[PDB]
Design goal:
Subunit structure (chain F): Component of the RNA polymerase II (Pol II) complex consisting of 12 subunits.
Order of helices and strands of chain B: HHHEHEHEEHEHEE
Strand order of the largest sheet of chain B: 1-2-3-4
Number of strands of chain A: 9
Helix content of chain A: 25-40%
Order of helices and strands of chain A: HEHEHHEEEHEEEEH
Number of helices of chain B: 7
CATH class of one domain in chain A: Alpha Beta
Number of domains of chain B: 2
Strand content of chain A: 15-25%
Structural class of chain A: alpha+beta
CATH architecture of the largest domain in chain B: 3-Layer(aba) Sandwich
Shape of chain A: elongated
Number of strands of chain B: 7
Strand order of the largest sheet of chain A: 1-2-4
Oligomer: part of a larger assembly
CATH architecture of one domain in chain A: 2-Layer Sandwich
Number of helices of chain A: 6
Subcellular location (chain F): Nucleus
CATH topology of the largest domain in chain B: Dna-directed Rna Polymerases I, Ii, And Iii 27 Kd Polypeptide, Chain: A, domain 1
Distance between the termini of chain B: 47 Å
Function (chain F): DNA-dependent RNA polymerase catalyzes the transcription of DNA into RNA using the four ribonucleoside triphosphates as substrates.
Family (chain F): Belongs to the RNA polymerase beta chain family.
CATH topology of one domain in chain A: Gyrase A, domain 2
Bound molecules: zinc ion
Protein name (chain F): DNA-directed RNA polymerase subunit beta
Largest sheet of chain A: 3 strands, antiparallel
């Protein structure tokens, strides 16, 4: 896979998007009835989630245009959230069709203090899709051996990062751990042996 | 398929790597024994559903017909894996002992996530023999394979005691290489051993450098 | 030719007024990795630059095989295209820290300007040629050169240190 | 000789720092001694962690959480404190910010304790650093506590006005906010002199168990400076 | 949000739960005062308010502002002044907000 | 306007040494009270007794960096002080800045504020749309610069006050040869005044590479 446009992306998104970057706002309402809300634009979202806790609520209003950029899914988003905390935090969510994306949830001695520390732990210690932010794609000039002998123009996509971790972004299915390269020579030496280090 | 389908694909590449290192170290191994496709691998070290059982992967290997020619006493090696994603000081004695008796000289445990501080504090406790520790997630890709990584090579205390006479060197005057160096480990060096590096050069074609291991 | 150029700046001016209208309407998408604002600049810059680039090129081919300045450039004994350009056509865009003349005055270049003027005549684009600058152009230009003089008076001895080290 | 004084400035402080933003104001009596002690109205808690507001006072070892600075001033109830900082009950954001802060000082409920936590012997000193050190311009008189309070309020305001992206970080090089010409120089210089003459004339008066003024310290002193280029004595 | 204080000793209001009856209360920890919940909303974070930044009628006397000859969506005049959001965010957008010398409206140029 | 853009030493200290334009001058140091008073008696309800909610959008006023109370409708407080300076009853050296966009009033007496002079525009033409100064004042030049100021025809604008004014370049205006040229409160005495002693002797400094000048 060299000039595989979509193959490029397929790796990009496999190498940093956080809940914090898709959330337009978050509020914590008082809803003591785990079978209906004190909120209108939420009703449906309850009933349609009982077929195929604490009275304290926490709602998140994610961005639409922001879910198309870094590309995301309520199913995923939450899926992640849920498995982050697990069996001590029941969470729900609407479906990509709606005109307002939302995520409700509750815990499981002073709860207004806890359900607020879990406010952050949600916006800054939870990833969706480390040290590797922005990741652009590029079409480079790579001279190469035509079968017929002569060298010829065979550009191939490449992913450039905006951060540096190697030991890890190396063993990823779809890369060539024989050509990867960070300008951080410090690293290269630590991973590939002083020699390769020198080379850098 | 879930996300466990990949925790296999890796344990496999990590495997082949081990092999390569073992043959490069100076042992027997067929190119095939390295080229065991992912397919014909699954059904060989798996149980029921589709999980791999490592306790059955570990193996031995020995000094090639050749290796005995430059290096006489180079003993036999033993590579081991473990299903305990946190192996400790107890499941240790099983390794520390298994060789101190069989009498090999080269131990190679492949800890998945990490060994206990109580554990490994029992390595240099069985000389002459020596033992090494390699993290899993660090052998997924053979590092030697890299573009920038030039070919290294060991040197009999003969080929060494030669370089020194041939260049009039006082050992210290020779470019060094770290004991905890990625490549140094890969070929399993020791404090006092030399290594000839041979890489491509846009000036002569090939240059021949040497690094002693401090 | 001095005319053919003028209108290569006018048209270039509108290809800016145009993308400014189309920005003051949110009618443009964010090129992945860049801010909606940043991406606005990225074009204005690439617009004025390409404008300026041919502005000069019109004169370059307009100077016969007798033009002395040309001669002193072909011989390779002094100056280049750029030079002719800034002297017979358009001086260019001024700049500091990489971005066209800032807003030192809340939302404006000089007090002689209307707030929020993101145009080129405000951000430091000297449309004039040395042969012909307007105060604004003349100023920005200075702020631009000023950055230049700066490092020629800084990189001068820090470069010498880095040198010294390599030696010792 | 070219940063002007008695003015409010707000600076953002780098990602690596326990402080988010901070506002300062360099103060000095335009005429009379002229102290060079500045006010720091910090804002801990980076743009994330679960965000207090503390300020620095002259001679105080550590820093104090704004609430106390108010009660210690003459404002003891909440909301009467938010009274000074925020000027629009319908600006929940800002107010929100303040919330966590109020909790900080919730433990000190009056002017007694207020001036205390600042360490009978200790309480008295507390006052001092407020009538002669705290935002010393405005006036160091006495019955104006109120005024300084509205400032420290206008300040804590300016802080937030930025930490909420409504006002940029203060332009450090906006020439308008920066020149001590000749005339002024002689001033700060003369004082340094006449003052040594002042306490000189104090010694002749402290020996007479019953003329003296060496008018050479103001003549020769002046010359030295002006001659070389070394102001200070 | 628009939270509340309390009569008696003008202070901050902390919330507590009406266990046995299931409903929200607000209170004080200086005295005893206690009032029911005004709204089920308690806290908001919001990761678009402040773009209209203080626009006193006198905003037609700040000469340093630009002049556009459009016509508000109501009074149909032709003397408007404008700018961009005052939200100093490197990621903001560039839409124009207009004020009219004949009303004090807030019409934009936006179209999405 | 205040400092010359070109004249400044190369290498070493460069930009740490500035020279004044021709028109620039420095403030000297006026008195505050004759203006503190002049205020709390023209709409300035003292800070001492303030109420944030009864007085919402209360434009707060500062004096030399001190907060001397707010004021209700200021639009006038403003165009009164400004009329006071132009007759010459509050030193032409003082600075007054109104920042509507924030609701505040800046008062500066300070000593060390660089300021330049400008023509006043004021749409004061019940005969059109104009510089208070006319060709009758000119040819009239017992008529010093002290009178050009005692008649509100020119103002001393420090850098701060500058922020809230709109300056017109060429008084007049505001051929295939000349350089292409692209609310006003003041006009520029002359652009060639932004230069200081040094450049003033340089011919056509507007035709050379700035770093050379
Ligand atoms: Zn109460
Ligand atoms: Zn209208």
């Amino acid at each position: 896979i060299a000039l595989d446009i979509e193959k490029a992306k397929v790796i990009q998104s496999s190498i940093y998007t956080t809940l914090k970057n898709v959330t337009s706002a978050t509020e914590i309402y008082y809803d003591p009835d785990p079978t209906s809300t004190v909120i209108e634009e939420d009703f449906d979202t309850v009933e349609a989630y009982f077929s195929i806790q604490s009275p304290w609520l926490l709602r998140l209003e994610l961005d639409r245009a922001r879910m198309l950029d870094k590309q995301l899914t309520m199913n995923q988003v939450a899926d992640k959230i849920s498995e982050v905390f697990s069996d001590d935090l029941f969470v729900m969510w609407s479906e990509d069709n709606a005109d307002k994306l939302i995520i409700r949830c509750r815990v499981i001695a002073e709860e207004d203090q806890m359900l607020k520390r879990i406010e952050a732990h949600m916006l800054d210690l939870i990833a969706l899709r480390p040290g590797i932010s922005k990741v652009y794609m590029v079409k480079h000039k790579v001279s190469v051996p035509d079968e017929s002998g002569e060298y010829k123009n065979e550009e191939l996509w490449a992913l450039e990062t905006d951060g540096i971790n190697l030991a890890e972004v190396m063993a990823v299915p779809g890369v060539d751990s024989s050509r990867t390269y960070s300008n951080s020579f410090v690293e290269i030496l630590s991973v590939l042996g002083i020699e390769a280090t020198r080379s850098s | 398929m879930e996300d466990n389908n990949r925790i296999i694909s890796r344990l496999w590449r990590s495997f082949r790597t081990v092999k390569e290192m073992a043959a490069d170290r100076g042992y027997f191994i067929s190119q095939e024994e390295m080229d065991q496709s992912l397919e014909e691998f699954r059904s060989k070290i798996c149980d029921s559903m589709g999980n791999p059982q490592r306790k059955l992967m570990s193996f031995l290997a020995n000094p090639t017909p050749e290796a005995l020619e430059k290096y006489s006493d180079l003993g036999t090696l033993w590579v081991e894996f473990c299903d305990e994603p946190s192996v400790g000081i107890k499941t240790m004695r099983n390794f520390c002992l298994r060789i101190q008796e069989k009498n090999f000289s080269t131990g190679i445990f492949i800890y998945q996530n990490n060994i206990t501080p109580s554990a490994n504090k029992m390595i240099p406790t069985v000389s002459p023999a020596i033992i090494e520790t390699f993290q899993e997630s660090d052998l997924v890709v053979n590092i030697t394979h890299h573009e920038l990584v030039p070919k290294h090579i060991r040197l009999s205390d003969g080929e060494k005691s030669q370089l020194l006479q041939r260049y009039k060197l006082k050992e210290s005057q020779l470019p060094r290489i770290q004991r905890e160096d990625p490549v140094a480990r890969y070929l399993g060096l020791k404090r006092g051993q030399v290594v000839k590096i041979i890489r491509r050069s846009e000036t002569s074609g090939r240059y021949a450098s040497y690094r002693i291991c401090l | 030719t001095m005319k053919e150029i003028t209108h290569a700046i006018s048209s270039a001016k509108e290809q800016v007024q145009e993308i400014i209208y189309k920005a003051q309407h949110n009618e443009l998408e964010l090129k992945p990795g860049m801010t909606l604002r940043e991406s606005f600049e990225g074009e204005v810059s690439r617009t004025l630059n390409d404008a300026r680039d041919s502005a000069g090129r019109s004169a370059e081919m307009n100077l016969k095989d007798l033009n002395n300045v040309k001669q002193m450039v072909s011989a390779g004994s002094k100056g280049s295209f750029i030079n002719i350009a800034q002297m017979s056509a358009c001086v260019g865009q001024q700049m500091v820290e990489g971005k066209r003349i800032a807003f030192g005055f809340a939302d404006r270049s000089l007090p002689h300007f209307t707030k929020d003027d993101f145009s080129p005549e405000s951000k430091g684009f000297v449309e004039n040629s040395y042969l012909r600058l307007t105060p604004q152009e003349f100023f920005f230009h200075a702020m631009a050169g000023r950055e230049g003089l700066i490092d020629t008076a800084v990189k001068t001895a820090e470069t010498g240190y880095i040198q010294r080290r390599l030696v010792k | 000789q070219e940063s002007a004084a008695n003015i409010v400035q707000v600076f953002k402080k780098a990602a690596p720092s326990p402080i988010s933003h901070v506002a300062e104001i360099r103060s000095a009596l335009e005429k009379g001694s002229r102290l060079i002690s500045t006010m720091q109205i910090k804002l801990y808690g980076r743009e994330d962690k679960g965000r207090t507001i503390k300020a620095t006072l002259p001679y105080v070892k550590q820093d104090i959480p704004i609430v106390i600075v108010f009660r210690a001033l003459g404002v003891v109830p909440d909301g009467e404190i938010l009274q000074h900082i925020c000027y629009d009950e319908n600006d929940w954001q800002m107010l929100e910010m303040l919330k966590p802060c109020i909790e900080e000082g919730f433990v000190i409920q009056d002017k007694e304790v207020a001036l205390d936590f600042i360490g009978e012997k200790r309480i008295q000193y507390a006052k001092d650093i407020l009538q002669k050190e705290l935002l010393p311009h405005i006036t160091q008189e006495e019955g104006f506590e109120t005024r300084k309070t509205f400032f420290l309020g206008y300040m804590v305001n300016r802080l937030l006005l930025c930490a909420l992206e409504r006002k940029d970080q203060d332009d450090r090089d906006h020439f308008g906010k920066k020149l001590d010409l000749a005339g002024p120089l002689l001033a700060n210089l003369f004082r340094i002199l006449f003052r040594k003459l002042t306490r000189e004339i104090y010694r002749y008066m402290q020996r007479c168990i019953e003329l003296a003024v060496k008018s050479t310290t103001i003549t020769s002193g002046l010359k030295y400076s002006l001659a070389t280029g070394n102001w200070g004595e | 949000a628009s939270f509340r204080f309390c009569l008696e000793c003008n202070n901050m209001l902390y919330p507590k739960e009406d266990k046995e009856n299931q409903r929200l209360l607000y209170s004080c920890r200086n005295c005893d005062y206690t009032e029911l919940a005004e709204d089920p909303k308690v806290y908001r974070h919001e990761l678009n308010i402040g773009e209209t930044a203080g626009i006193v009628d006198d905003i037609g006397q700040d000469p340093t502002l630009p002049r556009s000859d459009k016509e508000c969506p109501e009074c149909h005049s032709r003397d408007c002044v404008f700018f961009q959001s005052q939200q100093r965010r490197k990621d903001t957008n560039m839409t124009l907000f207009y004020v009219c010398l004949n009303c004090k409206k807030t019409f934009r140029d936006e179209s999405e | 306007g205040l400092v010359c853009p070109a004249e400044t030493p190369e290498g070493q200290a460069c930009g740490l040494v500035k020279n004044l334009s021709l028109l620039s001058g420095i403030s000297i140091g006026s008195p505050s009270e004759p203006i503190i008073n002049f205020l709390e008696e023209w709409g300035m309800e003292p800070l001492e007794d303030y109420d944030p909610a009864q007085h919402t959008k209360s434009t707060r006023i500062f004096v030399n960096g001190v907060w001397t109370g707010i004021h209700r409708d200021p639009s006038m407080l403003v165009s009164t002080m400004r009329d006071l300076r132009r007759s010459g009853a509050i030193s032409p050296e003082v600075s007054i800045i109104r920042d509507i966009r924030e609701r505040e009033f800046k008062i500066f007496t300070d000593v060390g504020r660089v300021y330049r002079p400008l023509f006043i525009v004021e749409d004061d033409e019940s005969k059109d749309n104009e510089l208070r100064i006319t060709k009758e004042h000119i040819r009239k030049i017992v008529y010093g610069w002290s009178s050009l100021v005692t008649s509100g025809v020119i103002e001393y604008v420090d850098g701060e006050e500058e922020e809230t004014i709109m300056i017109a370049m060429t008084p007049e205006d505001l051929d295939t040869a000349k350089r292409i040229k692209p609310t006003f409160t003041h006009c520029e005495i002359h652009p060639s005044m932004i230069l200081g002693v040094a450049a003033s002797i340089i011919p056509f400094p507007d035709h050379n590479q700035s770093p050379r000048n």
